[PDB]
């Protein structure tokens, strides 16, 4: 019915479990007091590569084929330079194949050094989409590589879903999961899994109000991507939802909570100071959502809430600027 099924998620689980961490679930009496709920934090910031994206990336490397005629990926290629590019490079390393990241001439010098440092080869294009698409198709062809989309690729969605298998096992009494949404690969993967195993558990998304395409798409009942590049501190959720995650989100996510930039910053600082977890601000989005005024509308029966702390890849010095 959708681009993935719970069977794909469990295959992904079997595919990646030997190489990822089963991250712990931590609690905070302080955050319980502030919210009135019993919170559980799924600590994907402690995952390999610093975010949950190693799950989708490794599943993609282990299950996609480059060609009808070649069953084995000989390289991986992607347009993402942040958490997805870092996770994919590491997945390719584990598999003994080369990683390529297609990089605009125009992206910052910091970006270029980062990619090289986590072990990918960089291939340069013009800033344009016609150039990005062209050089990538080129690299993919010369290397017999696979492109791995950060959020719309079925194998990636299915790998991110494995977060929910662990959550449901680790938190048997959970009433809801709260997931930051960008392109919606993780949300969609988790929604598929939760609704297949225990559909009375709510799946809520948390979204910056400055990048609120997933909220607007669910409100309008059709896919409404951001018309302009969003500006938010929550850098991992600037992507819009897409054609493969939208139908899942439409049908299987219970609600979307939006949070302001100040809410994201306050929640992030609260987790740093009160939990001592160095989350990236994008991972503060879900905490913000549960602290938010609108979350009070959620029923008191929804008591046990697991928040995915999705990543910890933050430049600590950069934080002075807020």
* Site track for Mg ion across 161-180, x = CB under 5 A: --------------x-----
3-state secondary structure 162-197: HHHHHHHHHCCCCCEEEEECCCCHHHHHHHHHHHHH
CB of 182 to its own copies, least distance (A): 20
**Active-site residue set:** 53, 81
Do the beta carbons of residue 230 and residue 260 sit within 8 Å?
no
Rule CB under 5 A: say whether 83 interacts with Na ion: yes
Rule CB under 5 A: say whether 6 interacts with Na ion: yes
Rule CB under 8 A: say whether 94 interacts with its own copies: no
DSSP bridge pairs for 276: none
Closest Cα to residue 308, out of 210, 172, 165, 192? 165
69's tokens: 């005629």
* Site track for its own copies across 254-293, x = CB under 8 A: ---------------x--xx-xxxxx--------------
* Site track for Mg ion across 191-220, x = CB under 5 A: ----------------x---x-xx------
CB of 303 to its own copies, least distance (A): 20
Q: Which is nearer to its own copies, 29 or 293 (CB)?
A: 29
Do the beta carbons of residue 284 and residue 236 sit within 8 Å?
no
Q: What residues numbered 172-211 form the site for its own copies, per CB under 8 A?
A: none
Q: Which is nearer to its own copies, 63 or 86 (CB)?
A: 86
Among 50, 145, 150, 184, the residue binding its own copies under the rule CB under 8 A is 50
* CA atoms of 218 and 196, how far apart (whole Å): 21
Rule CB under 5 A: say whether 85 interacts with Na ion: no
Instruction: Report whether 28 belongs to an annotated binding site.
Output: yes
- DSSP conformation letters of 111-145: HHHHHHHTTPEEEEE-SSHHHHHHHHHHHHHHHT-
Strands 25-26, 38-43: pairing kind: antiparallel
Binding site for Mg ion (CB under 5 A): 175, 207, 211, 213-214
């Amino acid at each position: 019915q959708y681009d993935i099924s719970f069977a794909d998620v469990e295959k992904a689980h079997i595919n990646i479990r030997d190489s990822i961490h089963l991250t712990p679930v931590l609690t905070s009496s302080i955050l319980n007091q502030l919210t009135g709920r019993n919170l559980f934090f799924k600590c994907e910031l402690f995952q390999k590569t610093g975010s949950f994206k190693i799950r989708g990336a490794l599943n993609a490397v282990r299950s996609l084929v480059p060609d009808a005629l070649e069953r084995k990926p000989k390289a991986v290629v992607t347009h993402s330079s942040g958490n997805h590019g870092q996770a994919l490079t590491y997945a390719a390393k584990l598999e003994g194949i080369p990683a390529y990241i297609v990089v605009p001439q125009t992206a910052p010098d910091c970006k270029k050094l980062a990619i090289q440092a986590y072990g990918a080869s960089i291939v340069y294009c013009e800033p344009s989409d016609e150039s990005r698409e062209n050089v990538a198709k080129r690299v993919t062809e010369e290397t017999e590589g696979i492109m791995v989309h950060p959020n719309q690729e079925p194998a990636v969605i299915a790998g991110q879903g494995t977060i929910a298998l662990e959550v449901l096992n680790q938190v048997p009494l959970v009433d809801a999961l709260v997931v930051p949404v960008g392109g919606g690969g993780m949300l969609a993967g988790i929604a598929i899994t939760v609704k297949a195993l225990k559909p009375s558990v709510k799946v809520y998304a948390a979204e910056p109000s400055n990048a609120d395409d997933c909220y607007q798409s669910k409100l309008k009942g059709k896919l409404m991507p951001n018309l302009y590049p969003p500006e938010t501190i929550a850098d991992g959720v600037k992507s819009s939802i897409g054609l493969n995650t939208w139908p899942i989100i439409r049908d299987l996510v219970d609600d979307i909570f939006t949070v302001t930039e100040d809410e994201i910053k306050c929640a992030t600082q609260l987790v740093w100071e009160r939990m001592k977890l160095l989350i990236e601000p994008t991972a503060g989005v879900g905490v913000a959502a549960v602290l938010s005024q609108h979350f009070q509308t959620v029923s008191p029966e929804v008591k046990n809430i697991c928040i995915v702390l999705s990543g910890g890849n933050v430049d600590l010095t950069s934080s002075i600027t807020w």
